[PDB]
């Protein structure tokens, strides 16, 4: 038998409890970064390692700018939730 | 055969699998939810990115809570025998554990339960990936200078 919850992965845009940023013209910080890292690395790296690069890209390259001090100068870390049981490569 | 290790998922089935993208941009008035400007940029980027990974991409726009549940139920009832994996991307407003249809919330657990190992037998043992662009709450991260 295997667990019924085995072999799921959740790639969340943000930490539990947190806001998630989206730009009117570029899209969301997370999806833009995810697509970029998949484009660059899906034929090269295991999926958790791609998602780790996505974490770094979102964490380092994005910061909010807002006229409202409440929402200004904010940062985001995505959150990988793996219940996978094997490494995942998009190529073979 | 030589030594066989089972450290990576079998990803050489005839099909990589489905990539369902739910793109919720426009919301009903009484929900009080703003239009998600930029989400189409995300949706196009994802369709192209997963196309190049050989996923069968299906885009769905502005689904109600009922339509989300119906879509996922129907997708989980397909025969995925010849497919390596399953991908679902959710682009919407959200809160912890919740994604918004155009007319109200859906528990993420309700969506993912359809794909449990006991409920979608043709995906048992295969990676099921849920990619979620939505808030998980209202907290803001102030960051720290390095
Ligand atoms: O960096 C951004 O993407 C950004 C985006 C916005 S926004 O007004 O386009 N979206 C925020 C509310 S959905 C405001 C400030 C920002 O720094
Ligand atoms: C709080 C939210 O659920 C949304 C998520 C989204 O991608 O629209 N975030 C915002 O509205 C901040 S841009």
């Amino acid at each position: 038998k295997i667990p019924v919850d085995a072999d799921f992965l959740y790639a969340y845009s943000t930490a539990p409890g947190y806001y998630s940023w989206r730009n009117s013209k570029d899209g969301s910080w997370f999806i833009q970064s995810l697509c970029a890292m998949l484009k660059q690395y899906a034929d090269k790296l295991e999926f958790m390692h791609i998602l780790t690069r996505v974490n770094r890209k979102v964490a380092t390259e994005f910061e909010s700018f807002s006229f409202d001090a409440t929402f200004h100068a904010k940062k985001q870390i995505p959150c990988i939730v793996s219940m996978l049981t094997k490494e995942l490569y998009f190529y073979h | 055969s030589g030594i066989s290790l089972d450290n990576s998922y079998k990803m050489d089935y005839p099909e990589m699998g489905l990539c369902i993208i739910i793109n919720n941009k426009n919301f009903h008035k009484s929900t009080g939810m703003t239009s998600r400007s930029g989400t189409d940029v995300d949706a196009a980027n994802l369709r192209e990115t997963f196309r190049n990974l050989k996923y069968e991409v299906r885009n769905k726009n502005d689904l109600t809570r009922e339509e989300i549940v119906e879509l996922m139920r129907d997708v989980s009832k397909e025969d995925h025998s010849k497919r390596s994996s399953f991908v679902c991307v959710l682009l919407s407003h959200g809160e912890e554990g919740i994604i918004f249809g155009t007319n109200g919330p859906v528990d993420l657990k309700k969506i993912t339960n359809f794909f449990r190992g006991d409920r979608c037998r043709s995906l048992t043992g295969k990676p099921k990936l849920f990619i979620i662009q939505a808030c998980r709450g209202t907290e803001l991260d102030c960051g720290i200078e390095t």
Side-chain angles (χ1 to χ4, degrees), chain B residues 1-131:
Chain B
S1 228
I3 294 167
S4 175
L5 308 173
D6 46 19
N7 294 315
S8 54
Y9 288 110
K10 178 181 168 65
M11 293 296 290
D12 66 349
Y13 284 86
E15 299 169 30
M16 287 289 281
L18 307 184
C19 175
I20 307 302
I21 300 173
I22 303 180
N23 180 33
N24 282 355
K25 180 169 71 175
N26 305 296
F27 295 81
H28 291 219
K29 300 100 267 169
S30 305
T31 62
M33 293 193 271
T34 54
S35 296
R36 297 180 57 261
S37 301
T39 189
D40 293 344
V41 179
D42 281 359
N45 207 356
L46 289 157
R47 172 178 199 91
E48 182 61 11
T49 297
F50 283 89
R51 182 188 77 89
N52 288 327
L53 298 181
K54 316 304 170 161
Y55 279 88
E56 179 181 332
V57 182
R58 296 183 198 166
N59 280 72
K60 287 293 198 176
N61 298 131
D62 297 341
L63 299 187
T64 59
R65 71 206 306 279
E66 293 88 358
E67 284 165 336
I68 288 174
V69 173
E70 169 187 47
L71 174 65
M72 289 294 101
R73 189 179 286 261
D74 290 356
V75 165
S76 73
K77 288 157 92 179
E78 297 186 12
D79 185 352
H80 299 259
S81 287
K82 294 178 174 181
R83 297 171 184 160
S84 298
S85 60
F86 175 72
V87 178
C88 171
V89 191
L90 304 168
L91 312 173
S92 199
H93 293 283
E95 285 166 19
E96 192 64 77
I98 291 159
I99 195 79
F100 281 93
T102 54
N103 71 333
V106 182
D107 281 350
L108 283 170
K109 204 72 176 155
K110 182 155 189 179
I111 290 168
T112 57
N113 273 349
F114 291 124
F115 301 87
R116 273 169 54 146
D118 61 340
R119 301 187 185 164
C120 184
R121 283 296 275 117
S122 57
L123 285 175
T124 304
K126 295 173 178 177
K128 301 165 267 288
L129 316 184
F130 291 80
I131 295 169

Side-chain angles (χ1 to χ4, degrees), chain A residues 19 21-24 27 29 63-66, chain B residues 34:
Chain A
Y19 196 75
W21 288 94
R22 170 182 39 80
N23 175 283
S24 316
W29 294 3
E63 181 180 312
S64 73
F65 177 86
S66 185
Chain B
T34 54

Side-chain angles (χ1 to χ4, degrees), chain A residues 4 7-11 13-14 16-20 22 24 27-28 39 70 74-75 85-87 89-90, chain B residues 7-9 11 16 36-38 42 45 49 53 96 112 117 128 130 132-141:
Chain A
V4 303
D7 307 307
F8 281 82
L9 179 123
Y10 300 78
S13 68
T14 194
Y18 279 75
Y19 196 75
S20 184
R22 170 182 39 80
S24 316
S28 62
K39 279 173 200 316
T70 300
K74 303 309 182 185
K75 299 289 293 179
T85 58
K86 290 177 180 174
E87 293 170 18
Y89 300 88
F90 293 107
Chain B
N7 294 315
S8 54
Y9 288 110
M11 293 296 290
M16 287 289 281
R36 297 180 57 261
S37 301
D42 281 359
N45 207 356
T49 297
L53 298 181
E96 192 64 77
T112 57
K128 301 165 267 288
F130 291 80
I132 305 172
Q133 173 49 46
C135 288
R136 294 176 73 190
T138 51
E139 298 185 50
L140 293 160
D141 189 315

